[PDB]
Amino acid sequence: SGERKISRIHLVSEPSITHFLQVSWEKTLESGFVITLTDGHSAWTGTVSESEISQEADDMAMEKGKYVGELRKALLSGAGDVYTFNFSKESCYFFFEKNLKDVSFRLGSFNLEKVENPAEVIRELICYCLDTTAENQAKNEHHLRVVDSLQTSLDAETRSRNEALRVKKKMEGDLNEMEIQLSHANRMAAEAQKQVKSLQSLLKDTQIQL
Amino acid sequence: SGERKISRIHLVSEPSITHFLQVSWEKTLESGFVITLTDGHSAWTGTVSESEISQEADDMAMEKGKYVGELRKALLSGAGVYTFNFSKESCYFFFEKNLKDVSFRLGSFNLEKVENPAEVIRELICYCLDTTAENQAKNEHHLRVVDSLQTSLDAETRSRNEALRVKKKMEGDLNEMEIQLSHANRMAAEAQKQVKSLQSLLKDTQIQL
C-alpha cells in the first residue's frame, strides 16, 4: 500500500519560490523512506534506509525515538520557522536544520539524484492529491448524512421528552385530586363514627333507665 | 469569491498520458471562465467570456441553460461520454459529446502556451494542498459534532428510560390510591348506615321511656 505526505517548503537559496517535498514510507518513517523535491519543472529523489536513520541518530548523540520525531516534524510538516531547508542543484545535496531563535544545528542530510522523468513524478503527485480530495469529499458527504440522522433522532427524543413531561403533570394532578377525595371520605367516616359513638352512649343511658 | 475545478482527462492523441484541466470562474460558469491544460511540463491557457459562451449556445441551436449544463459535465468532470482533443501545433482544443457511435462537437478553445508553466503548476499544487488541509479540518470538526450529538443522544436515551420507570411507579400509585379511595367511600357509607340503624333503635327505646 504505502503512505505519503506532500509538504510545501522554502529553500534558503530560493525564498521567492515554493517547493514541494514528497516523502513516502512503508509502515513507519523509522523503517526507511523515499524523498522527492520538486519545483514546478524538475525533480530530485533520494532514499533513506532504516540503517542510515539509526546511524544518523547515533552520530548525533540523539535518542532514536526522539530523532525520528524530529524527522517527522521537519519532513512531514508536523511542526509548531523552526526548520530550514537547503539544496544545491549542482551537488544535489539536501540538508535541513532545526532553529531556535538564533541558534541552529544540522538535523539531517540527503543526496537527491535528479530524475530524468520529472513530469511523470509531477503527474503522479497531482493525481494523488486529486484522489485524496475525492475521498475526503465522500467522507464529508457521509458525515453530513450521519449528522442529519443524529439531529433527527435528537429532535424526536426532545419532542417525546416534552410530551411525557405534560403527561407526568396530569398524572400528578390526578393523584392529588384523588388524595383530596380520600381526605374528604375519611373525614366523613370519622365524623359519622363520632355520631355513632354518641348514639351508642345515648342508647345505653336510655336503656339504663328502663 | 472565485471557484475552480481540476479534472483529469485523456487526450485522443495521447491516451497513455493523463492530462489535467483546470477551469476557474467567479459565480457561475455562465459568466465566463479561464481554462488551462497541463501535462505537468507545459501548460496552455485560454479565456472564454460570457459573450463567447452565450454566442456559442445560440450558434449551436441550443438553449443557454442546457449548453452551460453540458459545459459543466464535460469540463468540470460532472458526468455519468466526453472526448478531448488538442494539437500542440495549433493550440486548438476541442471536445465532443458521444453516444454509442454518434458524436458531435460540443465546444472549442484556442489555448495560448504559457511561458511560465512551472509557476502555474506550483499554484495548482498549492491549491490542492490547501484544499486537502481545509477538508482535513472540516473532517476533524465533523467528528467533534458527531461525538457531541451522540453524547446528547445517550443522555436523552438514559433520561427517557429513567422517566419511564418513574411513570410505572406513578401508575402503581394511582391504582393503589384508587382501591384506597374505594374502601374509604364504602366505610363512610357504612358509618351512615350504622348511624341510621342506631337512630331508629334510639327513637324506639325512648318511646318506651
Q: Which residue has the cell 494523488?
A: A128
- Chain A partners of B188 at a C-beta cutoff of 8 Å? 185-186, 188-189, 192
State the angle between helix axes of A64-75 and A50-59 in degrees (0 to 180), rounded to the nearest 10: 110
Task: Give the CA angle between residues B136, B138, B144 to the nearest 5°.
Answer: 105
Ordered DSSP codes for B73-104: HHHTT----EEEEEETTTTEEEEEEE-SS-EE
* CB of B20 closer than 8 Å to CB of B8: yes
Which residues lie closer than 8 Å to B94 by C-beta, 6 or more apart?
B85, B86, B105, B107, B108, B109
How was it solved?
X-ray
Asked if A6 and B129 come within 8 Å (Cβ–Cβ), the reply is yes
* Closest alpha carbon to A119 in B23, B16, B13, B93: B16
- Burial bucket for residue B174 (CB in 10 Å: 0-12, 13-18, 19+): middle
C-alpha cell at B177: 390510591
Selected residue of B6, B37, B156, B161 to mutate for chain A interface (largest A Cβ count, 10 A): B156
- Say how many CA atoms lie within 13 Å of A116 toward its Cβ: 0
* CB of A180 closer than 8 Å to CB of B180: no
C-alpha cell at B115: 511561458
* Closest alpha carbon to B96 in B86, B77, B109, B81: B81
DSSP lists the bridge partners of residue A106 as A97
* CB of B48 closer than 8 Å to CB of B109: yes
Residues in chain B: 209
SS3 content of chain B, % helix, strand, coil (to 5): 55, 30, 15
Strand ranges for chain A from DSSP E:
3-11, 14-25, 32-38, 43-49, 83-88, 93-99, 104-111, 113-114
| Domains parsed from chain B with CATH numbers | 1-116 (2.170.210.10), 117-174 (1.20.5.370)
Distance from CA of A129 to the nearest CA of B (A): 6
C-alpha cell at B168: 410505572
What CA–CA distance (Å, rounded) separates A78 from A81? Answer: 12
- Chain A partners of B138 at a C-beta cutoff of 8 Å? 140
Produce one character per residue of A160-176: b if its CB has 16 or more CB atoms within 10 Å, e if not. Answer: eeeebeeeeeeeeeeee
- Burial bucket for residue B181 (CB in 10 Å: 0-12, 13-18, 19+): middle
* Closest alpha carbon to A10 in A72, A96, A93, A70: A96
Asked if B139 and A144 come within 8 Å (Cβ–Cβ), the reply is no
Of B143, B173, B185, the CB nearest to A175: B173
What CA–CA distance (Å, rounded) separates B78 from B163? Answer: 51
C-alpha cell at A125: 503527485
> CB count, 10 Å around CB of B207?
7
Asked if A140 and B142 come within 8 Å (Cβ–Cβ), the reply is yes
Distance of CA B192 to the CA centre of its chain: 75
* Closest alpha carbon to B14 in A41, A114, A119, A126: A119
Residue B159: phi, psi to the nearest 5?
-65, -40
Of A126, A167, A178, the CB nearest to B128: A126
